[PDB]
Design a protein around this ligand. Sequence first.
Ligand SMILES: Nc1nc2c(N)ncnc2[nH]1
Ligand SMILES: [Cl-]
Lengths: 382, 111
Amino acid sequence: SMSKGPAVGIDLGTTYSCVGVFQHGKVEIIANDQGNRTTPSYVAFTDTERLIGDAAKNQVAMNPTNTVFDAKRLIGRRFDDAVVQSDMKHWPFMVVNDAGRPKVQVEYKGETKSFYPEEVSSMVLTKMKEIAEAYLGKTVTNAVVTVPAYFNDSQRQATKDAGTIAGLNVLRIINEPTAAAIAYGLDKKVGAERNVLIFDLGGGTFDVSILTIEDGIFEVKSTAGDTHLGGEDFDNRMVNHFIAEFKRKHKKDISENKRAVRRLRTACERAKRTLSSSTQASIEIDSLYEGIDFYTSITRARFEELNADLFRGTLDPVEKALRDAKLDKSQIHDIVLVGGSTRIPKIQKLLQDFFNGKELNKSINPDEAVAYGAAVQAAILS
Amino acid sequence: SNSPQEEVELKKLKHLEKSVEKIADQLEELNKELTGIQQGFLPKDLQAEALCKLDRRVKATIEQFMKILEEIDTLILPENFKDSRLKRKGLVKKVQAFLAECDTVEQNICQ
Ligand SMILES: Nc1nc2c(N)ncnc2[nH]1
Ligand SMILES: [Cl-]
């Protein structure tokens, strides 16, 4: 049997989750069994087994109906909630009503089974706990779990319940924008009260939060954003551009061939990431459609133009948040970048220009900043 | 004009060719089982049930070939690398011919 380990920080996210540990005076983000620093918030049920994380996401094409994701969208909510009713139209898994509460319904080992969203989230939390144990070589029980600042009492309680089901001792539940501020040590800066804007563009949601830090106390002043905005929207624009390109050059429509669209979409996701560090990305796809090779490239400028309205639109939530908090943009002391999409240079440029050339807090990996702050908090509470 | 740089790409392609051979062996075993049921002792009704039991395995095979295509699609081979470009083209065509066989199987089970 393993020795007792330290307390961890867990960001239970919509699409991906992240676990960190404060050790040797620094936060270490823990890689999963597949070497990934983030784990898909996916749970799959097969004729023979239950899969969590990368293993669940990797078979989604094979088993779409029994592969649950987005349980965070449903946690702590009533079945009749507008968000539940709107969101389920887009899920390939069934969502059923059990006395006013939503449940995911799946086929598991040849039997029909239903799960509360907190049971699905507890399976993701169990996987995060195991990821931490596998790296540390010690038992992990204590953790700090993060929630969105807009989560209600029911949504907060249901997240804590997922922690309890997973065998975790939840030290504290802290807001995601608060965790990002803690990661950058914004509550340790000397001086008067500071106004913090957290720009979170990642995990299929866009969240803008404004906090005030006064004498080490965090107050949520306002929240704004778009629930379904993310990297995928940017990806779609590149996919549409390429399909149109293939039509112009070869007078062939590839859009009805799922495999051709998939090969193109996968190449676009990669090319987009390349465009955050380089000014051009090349794509070589042999026999993409009807034996035609698709050799092309896209510049950062073309990618920016294709997404101009989506990138520019990210500032509307910021203005709405500043309006609700009753603050001018000149009153913001710190700007924090959270989510993988904040790596996009045009997004950084638009936000920095809006804040009159002010430098952004972006040194910590955006996808890891929330788990980073939760891991710091977990060490503080140990 | 053979470069040491090109040997790096040919080695990546040879590894992908071996991975394709492993998936192709699974497809071969699936074809033997499909044929066995179709030409077997089971009555027509029990045959359809036995064939639909192979559905998970065919879908796993299709997915494995798709992941190989996505890995091949990450390669960038300059025009001068003729042998690498020919090997990549031949490998994609080989995977596509296997995917077409998988499609034939998938369309003949769970009908
Ligand atoms: N997670 C993630 N990484 C990136 C990146 N490198 N560039 C753009 N979007 C991204 N999203
Ligand atoms: Cl690690």
